[PDB]
Design a protein around this ligand. Structure first.
Ligand SMILES: NCc1ccc(CNC(=O)[C@@H]2CCCN2C(=O)[C@H](N)Cc2ccccc2)cc1
Ligand SMILES: *[C@@H]1O[C@H](CO)[C@@H](O)[C@H](O)[C@H]1NC(C)=O
Ligand code: NA
Ligand code: NA
Lengths: 251, 11, 28
């Protein structure tokens, strides 16, 4: 996260760290959506251009974390993966269309002050809140600058951007399964996701029921915090029927 | 880098 | 689930975090 701040304790209790077993290193962010299911970006697990194709046994998820590098004894919980599910139409060849994946945990995680699931949006909450200028919140342990790494989880609030501005900012083909967010050059304020924040959540607090909803997943961009560039996020609601199909069938 | 995690989680 | 999106250390205690108001002010 570039130009963010340190998270408060318990501020993002759905945050998940995807962690490689060997070498032990951070792979991506992710989010807790129930006691057994974690949501992330497909490119965190499968990206053939970079020779990335992880299997369940390669990975752990670490839940309840604040510090990036510490083992947070009596606070974080570490879970093994039962199964990875990648969207069947995830487009790793072109533009990361449908950049979404689910991970089922081997055992349910116990909720605590530090571990709690985020809601997924319904159609009406998405329609109300996914509007240009409305702000969401992005969290992660990724890089602090494009070209280092944080002691603790970072947080930044960013406005959703009008679709024509998103389209006009890049040569990559945008789809309805994406939205973009960030400040414009003339808005002065700054902030962005960066490499290592992949797969983490873009959340909004509904003003109707005072609950947090995950509207996006950190997906792609060009550089970090560049003027005139915006971060792109997987549109969770647009892909929710697939999420529900997977959870109903498997779970 | 990262603090070693308990061996139980590494199988 | 029934309790999703309500944080133990914030909503469940009626405590706000330091920047959530910035989000609310943008929902116009
Ligand atoms: N600061 C926003 C941001 C947010 C999130 C990230 C992390 N995401 C990536 O690194 C992806 C993975 C494959 C490659 N990516 C990219 O973004 C590429 N620069 C562009 C690309 C390439 C192929 C297909 C689609 C897009 C980076 C910057
Ligand atoms: C990813 O790896 C699995 C083996 O675990 C393989 O079956 C699958 O075809 C691979 N996917 C791609 C796109 O290479
Ligand atoms: Na209300
Ligand atoms: Na920018």
């Amino acid at each position: 996260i570039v130009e963010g701040s340190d998270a408060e304790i318990g501020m993002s209790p759905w945050q998940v760290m995807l962690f490689r077993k060997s070498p032990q290193e951070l792979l991506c962010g992710a989010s807790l959506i129930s006691d057994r299911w974690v949501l992330t970006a497909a490119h965190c697990l499968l990206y053939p251009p970079w020779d990335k194709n992880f299997t369940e046994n390669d990975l752990l998820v670490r839940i309840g974390k604040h510090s990036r590098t510490r083992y947070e004894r009596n606070i974080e919980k570490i879970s093994m993966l039962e199964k990875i599910y990648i969207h069947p139409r995830y487009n790793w060849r072109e533009n990361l269309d449908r950049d979404i994946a689910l991970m089922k945990l081997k055992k349910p995680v116990a909720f605590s002050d530090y571990i709690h699931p985020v809601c997924l949006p319904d159609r009406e909450t998405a329609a109300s809140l996914l509007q240009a200028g409305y702000k969401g919140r992005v969290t992660g342990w990724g890089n602090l600058k494009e070209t280092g790494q944080p002691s603790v989880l970072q947080v930044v609030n960013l406005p959703i951007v009008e679709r024509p501005v998103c389209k006009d900012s890049t040569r990559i083909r945008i789809t309805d399964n994406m939205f973009c967010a960030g400040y414009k050059p003339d808005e002065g304020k700054r902030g962005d996701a960066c490499e290592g924040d992949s797969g983490g959540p873009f959340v909004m607090k509904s003003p109707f029921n005072n609950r947090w909803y995950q509207m996006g997943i950190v997906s792609w961009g060009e550089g970090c915090d560049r003027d005139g560039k915006y971060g792109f996020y997987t549109h969770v609601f647009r892909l929710k029927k697939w999420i529900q199909k997977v959870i109903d069938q498997f779970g | 880098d990262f603090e070693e995690i308990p061996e139980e989680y590494l199988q | 689930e029934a309790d999703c999106g309500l944080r133990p250390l914030f909503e469940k205690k009626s405590l706000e975090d330091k920047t959530e108001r910035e989000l609310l002010e943008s929902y116009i």
